[PDB]
């Protein structure tokens, strides 16, 4: 008997090949530039690199037999062409009979889709190779990669609730920490935008610098995620909606006017600091201790988030607040327009 996840996976891929279907091939051939060969090459490159890392031991990850790697890979390739066909068929340009060459020639989409497929398969088998293992192995930037998850969730309805939950979890992981690492492509995108961080109001309502759209979507997801977390905290801490709006305003200020604070840190660290300093200055005060016990009941919350925090060297959240956060945000805080809460 297979586990529910692996049997579900088996149901999704039943009767299908690790090659393009006739329908997909036809779409490929209606393009001025037919992607089919370059797509094969990407899967071949990804497949080889995956097998090399899978079968070799890193001291944190005992290596595993090539026959299992290939079976994992094969399954992910079947999923890839299935989801790609679904995506291409439902595309607007396809429905209007317009050439999809430019759409189909973006390498980052195909790489991300194949990685997400590999992640689906690995998860289904309860692999020890935990995200972000697959995107570090394949050299996929978190800032680019996360965008495919929502496409996958949309384009394959055969995914289980548990599979979708996992995909949402690793998107949250990217949004909260991984895309903020010092070497993330996020910083590049902000850079060509003159380090102008979009405000919540700007992205939560419908010749540009490139990555403008990428910046807008990423921060929309970030603002959306942080608002959900802040709403829960305010509920469990039973705070007025006015302090909530003030806490939100302070948090946005740190994202927009102190974005370097997020580099190599965690989104929730800035959100919890925003909570306390605003509760403090408005005399609605809650202790950081009760702030954090309320925080820890959230799904993403692990001890290291407020216990291990980057200082310059690591310390708990309180030390971060005192030696770093206060100095930067106290001018804005001591000042208590308020931002819209999503």
């Amino acid at each position: 008997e297979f586990t529910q996840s692996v049997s579900r996976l088996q149901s999704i891929v039943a009767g299908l090949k690790n090659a393009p279907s006739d329908q997909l091939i036809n779409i490929f051939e209606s393009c001025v530039r037919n992607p089919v060969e370059n797509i094969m090459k990407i899967l071949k490159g990804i497949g080889e690199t995956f097998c090399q890392h899978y079968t070799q031991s890193t001291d944190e990850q005992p290596g595993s037999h090539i026959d299992f790697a290939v079976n994992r890979l094969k399954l992910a390739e079947i999923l890839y062409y299935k989801i790609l066909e679904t995506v291409m068929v439902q595309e607007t340009r396809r429905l209007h009979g317009m050439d999809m060459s430019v759409l189909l020639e973006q390498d980052i989409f195909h790489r991300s889709l194949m990685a997400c497929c590999l992640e689906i398969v690995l998860f289904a088998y309860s692999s020890p190779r935990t995200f972000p293992w697959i995107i570090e192995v394949l050299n996929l930037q978190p800032f680019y990669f996360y965008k495919v998850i929502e496409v996958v969730i949309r384009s394959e309805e055969g995914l289980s609730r548990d599979m979708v939950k996992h995909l949402n979890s690793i998107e949250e992981q990217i949004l909260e920490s991984l895309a903020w690492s010092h070497d993330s492509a996020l910083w590049e995108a902000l850079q060509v935008s003159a380090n102008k961080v979009p405000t919540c109001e700007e992205v939560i309502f419908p010749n540009r610098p490139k990555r403008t759209g990428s910046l807008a979507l990423f921060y929309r997801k970030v603002y959306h995620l942080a608002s959900v977390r802040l709403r829960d905290l305010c509920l469990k801490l039973d705070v007025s909606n006015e302090l909530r709006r003030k806490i939100w305003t302070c948090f946005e200020f740190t994202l927009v006017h102190c974005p370097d604070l997020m580099k190599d840190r965690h989104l929730d660290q800035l959100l919890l600091c925003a909570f306390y300093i605003m509760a403090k200055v408005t005399k609605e005060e809650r202790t950081f201790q009760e702030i954090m016990k309320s925080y820890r009941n959230q799904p993403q919350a692990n001890s290291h988030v407020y216990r291990s925090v980057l200082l310059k060297e690591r310390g708990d959240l309180i030390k971060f607040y005192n030696t770093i956060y206060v100095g930067r945000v106290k001018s804005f805080a001591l000042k208590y327009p308020l931002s819209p809460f999503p």
Binding site: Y276, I277, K280, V281, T287, F288, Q289, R307, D316, I318, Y321, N322, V326, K330, A333, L334
Partner: peptide, 9 residues
């Protein structure tokens, strides 16, 4: 004043 004088756990 705006500093946090609490400690942990």
């Amino acid at each position: 004043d705006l500093y946090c004088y609490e400690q942990l756990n």
